[PDB]
Design a protein around this ligand. Sequence first.
Ligand SMILES: Nc1ncnc2c1ncn2[C@@H]1O[C@H](C[S@+](CC[C@H]([NH3+])C(=O)[O-])CC(=O)[O-])[C@@H](O)[C@H]1O
Ligand SMILES: Nc1ncnc2c1ncn2[C@@H]1O[C@H](C[S@+](CC[C@H]([NH3+])C(=O)[O-])CC(=O)[O-])[C@@H](O)[C@H]1O
Ligand SMILES: Nc1ncnc2c1ncn2[C@@H]1O[C@H](C[S@+](CC[C@H]([NH3+])C(=O)[O-])CC(=O)[O-])[C@@H](O)[C@H]1O
Ligand SMILES: Nc1ncnc2c1ncn2[C@@H]1O[C@H](C[S@+](CC[C@H]([NH3+])C(=O)[O-])CC(=O)[O-])[C@@H](O)[C@H]1O
Lengths: 327, 329, 329, 327
Amino acid sequence: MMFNFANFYQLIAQDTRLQPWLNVLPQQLTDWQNAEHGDFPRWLKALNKIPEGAPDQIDIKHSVTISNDTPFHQGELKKLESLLRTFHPWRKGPYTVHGIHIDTEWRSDWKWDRVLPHISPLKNRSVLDVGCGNGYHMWRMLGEGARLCVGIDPSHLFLIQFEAIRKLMGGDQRAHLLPLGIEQLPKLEAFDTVFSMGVLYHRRSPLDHLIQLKDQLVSGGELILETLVIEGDETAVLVPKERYAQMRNVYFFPSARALKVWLELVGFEDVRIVDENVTSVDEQRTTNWMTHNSLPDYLDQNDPSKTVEGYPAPRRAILVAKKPGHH
Amino acid sequence: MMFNFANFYQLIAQDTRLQPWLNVLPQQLTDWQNAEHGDFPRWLKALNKIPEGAPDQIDIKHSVTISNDTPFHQGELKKLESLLRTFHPWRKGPYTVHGIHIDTEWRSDWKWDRVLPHISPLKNRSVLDVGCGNGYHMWRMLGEGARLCVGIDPSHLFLIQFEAIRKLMGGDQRAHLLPLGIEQLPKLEAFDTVFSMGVLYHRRSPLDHLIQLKDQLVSGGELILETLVIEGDETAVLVPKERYAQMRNVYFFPSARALKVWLELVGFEDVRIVDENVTSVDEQRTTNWMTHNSLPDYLDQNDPSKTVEGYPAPRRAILVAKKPGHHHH
Amino acid sequence: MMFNFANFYQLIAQDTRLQPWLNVLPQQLTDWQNAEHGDFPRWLKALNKIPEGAPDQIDIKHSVTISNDTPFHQGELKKLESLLRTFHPWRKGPYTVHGIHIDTEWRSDWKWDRVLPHISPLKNRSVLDVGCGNGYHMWRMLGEGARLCVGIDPSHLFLIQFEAIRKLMGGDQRAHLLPLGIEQLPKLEAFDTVFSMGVLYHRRSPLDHLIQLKDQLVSGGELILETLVIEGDETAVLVPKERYAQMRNVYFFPSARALKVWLELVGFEDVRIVDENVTSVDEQRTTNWMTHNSLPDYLDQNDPSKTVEGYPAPRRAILVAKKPGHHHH
Amino acid sequence: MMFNFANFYQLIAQDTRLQPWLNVLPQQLTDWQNAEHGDFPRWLKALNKIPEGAPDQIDIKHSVTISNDTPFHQGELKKLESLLRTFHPWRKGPYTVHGIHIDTEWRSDWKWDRVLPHISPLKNRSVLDVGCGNGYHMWRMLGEGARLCVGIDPSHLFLIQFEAIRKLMGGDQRAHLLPLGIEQLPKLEAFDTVFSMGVLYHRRSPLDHLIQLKDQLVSGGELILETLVIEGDETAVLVPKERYAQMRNVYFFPSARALKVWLELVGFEDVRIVDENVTSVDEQRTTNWMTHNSLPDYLDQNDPSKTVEGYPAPRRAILVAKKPGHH
Ligand SMILES: Nc1ncnc2c1ncn2[C@@H]1O[C@H](C[S@+](CC[C@H]([NH3+])C(=O)[O-])CC(=O)[O-])[C@@H](O)[C@H]1O
Ligand SMILES: Nc1ncnc2c1ncn2[C@@H]1O[C@H](C[S@+](CC[C@H]([NH3+])C(=O)[O-])CC(=O)[O-])[C@@H](O)[C@H]1O
Ligand SMILES: Nc1ncnc2c1ncn2[C@@H]1O[C@H](C[S@+](CC[C@H]([NH3+])C(=O)[O-])CC(=O)[O-])[C@@H](O)[C@H]1O
Ligand SMILES: Nc1ncnc2c1ncn2[C@@H]1O[C@H](C[S@+](CC[C@H]([NH3+])C(=O)[O-])CC(=O)[O-])[C@@H](O)[C@H]1O
């Protein structure tokens, strides 16, 4: 055992639509325990030292912020910041936790602000965040009164990052992060909304990825799809020979208009392109909490409209679609 | 879904020793749902109509009896008896439930009275009842303050019977009946005591059966083993060509002394023969709640010391043993 | 058993590089037998009535033609033509077999004439023809003195078509057609050359298709890849919402220049675009041996530069590449 | 690869009844290759140095003897005896190979002489020898003109012993030894006669063993069963607490009369007890070619009617039965 999913098993046991997941999940999480990880003992020691118990004040609507009415002992807060810094690098956020500003590489709040206007309201929806990161968005989803948020992300570190914020929220049992790939989920068809943001370009079969997403949605369930794109008509599809913005293991970068046809082919209805944004270096930068290289380093030093490799520079697109049938 | 094991999954999720069972159990129970059963929709309709919520008085120590301080409406009690009668045939008991006497084929209380004197105390033990029936014994095990009782029995009907009594106990979550064969359990090694009573003669590989039991016990954990036997030394082993007391799918009937060597060979310690009883027709008979044939039908009409087939008549033996190692508790 | 692969099992048993295929193939072929097919009993009856034993003259170099020095009885030849016609529709060819011209829908000879100029010599190579059809090309591959030809094609009919020509070649054991999808092959890395012609647009994951091909090649082994394309730079990739030329289960149509980058990304070396051809209605037409609809039906009746659906009309591209490493031969 | 079963795969490919075995056999033999063995490289080096090519004269009818009309060079024969001695210990035989007498621990010829009188003639039968040893009996089975003999035995050494004699028979392709347990065979129902001699007492589920045998027989196929027994009626079944004649991992020793009921229960017809023999120290002894301990050592030093452990001394029984249906 690295980490005990006892409470998740309990949740999905008592869910009519998720119980069938127990037929495959526990053997996968058992095998994940046994693929031991160098840094997980250390990370755990730190997560255990993080103050237990509820905060007084929580805002997950306009931000992800945690405070107490009584200011917390300046000894315990210097220790907390120290603990949280053990989980470097901090890519998705930002978080303000008892007045510690976790300035994450990404302004993941901005991406949320772009998405929210175009989704069906999350009030009482079950959501899947595919490639959820440390689960920043799952917190914002609960902010809009989602019933339940399930994140999946292979990163051991992003699990510890999430369990840290969760512990500091007093162990909120309405969000969970499972250390799985999307390819490991069976055809659950259990979720009202599914988010897949920043995953498609990492997946060697994009069509199979769109189908795997469709397979987690109930009838008339809603898909938010966010991915890096290029400009063009339905025939515009960049597949890089080598790297794109210093990433390796990346595959398809279709135009928003091609991706819209792809989603239709696979069987989605009401497919809408609702935003195209060109990632600025104010949205993605190196920080105090993520000290590695970031977008400035990945652009052409003399042309920010291009990647170092010469390809069109990062452009993110949001598409929203319905799976066929009624809700 | 015939029956939702939601609460069992919840229990074993939060147990250190049982959580690994989630790696194999749920796909088996899923497949059990999908092997449809003729009578289970009907049985369920009846189980749902049984009054839910706690009784005032429960005795699971000297019997299995349920009563309220407030008398029940004679309308509601005639309806209850009617509901409970739909779960015919009632083989293991007996139960007294709001003054309705379920006269079961078996005096399963008597077998309990024979066993209890020879076991380590159940106070705070986790127990596995292999071939538990409707779980009569699991109730008596909680009566002796067992922490947790898990029953294994393939019978769809014995599940309905159990969930009926459980509902009438106010949904006691300390006993559970899973519709599995012992052969379907992995090597859990999670149980303080394991009962296997009336199973060994049904199992084509007796030694594999003893090992499957040993594999559910923690270190120094205790096995109660009850089975039909014959008289003789350690080389006395009846394997019937025919049937034995009308039973069709039946294999080994060793002497208590042979079974004791078998248990030793397989690796058990402190193996003790603690009782041999010749099943009387007062212990196993036809009744108003089990109207089918029973032991008097299965004996020679001329000689009750023999089965109709001519073999020595039913003789049940209790053996108790320890799995190697020290028991921490 | 629909068809017994006894001889294939025998071949691959005695091959160093193919024997590991016995770990997975036979259970797949067993399951294929048990997925019964309406027409296969009939087709078999006809294949069995085709004269067995060697012809005197075989040309598999400039054509696929079979003749005898002794004229055949006009009784036996009318019967043969009748037998061969039961295997309608005949899509890949053409074949001339004891003077019977099988006018196949496709001039598959022409596609061969386009390919041969750009390949490393097949003399003594083991080849895999992925989506081989009735195996027309595997015959031409042996014509260039390939050591061994293995075809993969799910079509029950294309198997019957192949075994017919093979029987009429006197049971040539150097070509074989297995009724598999490419997705069913393990990572054999056993083949000098691999052909994939007319398959990529049928496959929902094109990159996984290119990798599955790379996985059948030995080091420095050669891939011929032929597929429908569009014009454009490396970002030109048609994925049709509708159908494309009446085809229903169809996915990626990249430009030859995009497909070349795709092959590079996946890890191929020396990737060359060696030909782009616009399928004429002289290369693909209805015939007396393929009486169904064909390309003229699938084009805009007003504009042969477009499909009925309005997309650019069929354009086939040949690419040739090397799998990394030195090729020992 | 330790050993290439290429020729066996070829045989069973072209057999109508054995081809289905290819659905499971090759993965098992692949896994057997990968469970490497300390001594198999060495044993192989020796097997490779054994003279190739046919002998002139072969008797597999009254013995297992190999000779040439021209006596073989006394240099090459001293080398052969040396090679064959590398395969110590030699338990089943005896063999006479170019005048080298392999005096095996067991007079396995005697056991054959006891069996032969009671079996249906092997002329053109396919046979399975379960726990075949080095395959001595499979040679005698071909002596009676069996069509094909398949032996199964987990012992790496007994495989090398067999391939040695086979090579010295000029690579006879009508007998084969697969390094499998009986439990590894599927329900082939492909064999005219099945021998199981000296296996039952080693098998923790005797009934499952009898069923596994029944499952390799065609309809009205014949089972020879040989095993150690005790005296008594159908209720006489010795299961030892510890060891029996120094063996561990031994289980049931029923009386011949109990075993006969067991065979009936499992579904065999025409079950016949055709011989009970008390193993003498002339049938099983230490030798020149098997220098380890043997039966004299396993008996009570002062009572040869008992094992060292005190149990009745070794007694072997032959039973013959038909699987239901016609041939
Ligand atoms: N097989 C896989 N299955 C699931 N996730 C995976 C897999 N492989 C990698 N990931 C995860 O995909 C995420 C990619 S970042 C998106 C985060 C957030 N949603 C965001 O939109 O800010 C993209 C970006 O912003 O560049 C990481 O968290 C990986 O672990
Ligand atoms: N594979 C199997 N696995 C588990 N149980 C099985 C299996 N096969 C049958 N059973 C069950 O074994 C029980 C046997 S009665 C013992 C009841 C109680 N304990 C009593 O001792 O009164 C025997 C007797 O009459 O004594 C039944 O409930 C079967 O469903
Ligand atoms: N999963 C699959 N795996 C393998 N083959 C498949 C699969 N699915 C379909 N096929 C087969 O792919 C072939 C396609 S035709 C190429 C014939 C010849 N090579 C030609 O180039 O003329 C295309 C064309 O018309 O050009 C058919 O024989 C299908 O059975
Ligand atoms: N699972 C198994 N499956 C098959 N064979 C096995 C297994 N385990 C062990 N064996 C084999 O069973 C044989 C036992 S000697 C019989 C030889 C010959 N038939 C004889 O009758 O002289 C018995 C004796 O004579 O004591 C050995 O060759 C083991 O490898």
